[PDB]
Amino acid sequence: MVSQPIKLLVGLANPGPEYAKTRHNAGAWVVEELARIHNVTLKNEPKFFGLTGRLLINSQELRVLIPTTFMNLSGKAIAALANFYQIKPEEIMVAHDELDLPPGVAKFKQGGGHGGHNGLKDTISKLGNNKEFYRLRLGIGHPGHADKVAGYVLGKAPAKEQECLDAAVDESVRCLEILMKDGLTKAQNRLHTFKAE
C-alpha cells in the first residue's frame, strides 16, 4: 500500500496554446487533470524550464512538472527540477504520447527505449543516460507511414478520437491516485484492463 516509487510526475509537452491539444501533449493532459482535481495551479519557474507544482496524495508528496521547453529539450527541465530536489531517475514517472498503443489505452512501464520520441530521448540523455525512469504511455495511435509520424503527433485528434483520449487521461489520473494509495502493482493491474469504447 504505502510504498511506491514516484516522487515526480512529468507531463511532456510543447509550449503554448497552439500545441496544447495536439497529440504530442498527451502527457501534459494527465498532469493538468491531476493538478486540477487536487486544486493546484502550476507555477512558471524559469529555473526549472517549466510549470511546477506540489500535490499531497494519500500523505505522499508528489511534485509535478510540465516543461515549457521544446519537446526535444524536455530533459533540461526534468534534470533541473530532479537535481534540485534530489529525485532519482527511478523516482520519476514521465507521461507521454505513445504511438504504439491505440487511443483509449494507457500503460505504466519502467524503463525501455525512447521509441523515437524526442522528449523521451532527451530525458534519457539529460538524466545521465539513464533509461530507468517510469513511463505513463498514453496511446495515440500511429499513421500508416513513418514519414507521416511527425505531422500526426503535431496534429489535433478529431472529436471522437479525442473522447477516447480524454477517457484514458481520466483513468490514468484515477490510477495515479491508486498508485499513491495501493502502490504500482495494483495501479497497473487496473490501468491495463482499461480500454475506452
Swiss-Prot record:
Major enzyme class? hydrolase
Site, Discriminates between blocked and unblocked aminoacyl-tRNA: residue positions: 14
Q: Where is this site: Stabilizes the basic form of H active site to accept a proton?
A: 97
**What GO molecular function terms would the record report?**
peptidyl-tRNA hydrolase activity; tRNA binding
Q: How does it assemble?
A: Monomer.
Q: What does this protein do?
A: Hydrolyzes ribosome-free peptidyl-tRNAs (with 1 or more amino acids incorporated), which drop off the ribosome during protein synthesis, or as a result of ribosome stalling.
Tell me what this protein is called: Peptidyl-tRNA hydrolase
What gene is behind this protein? pth
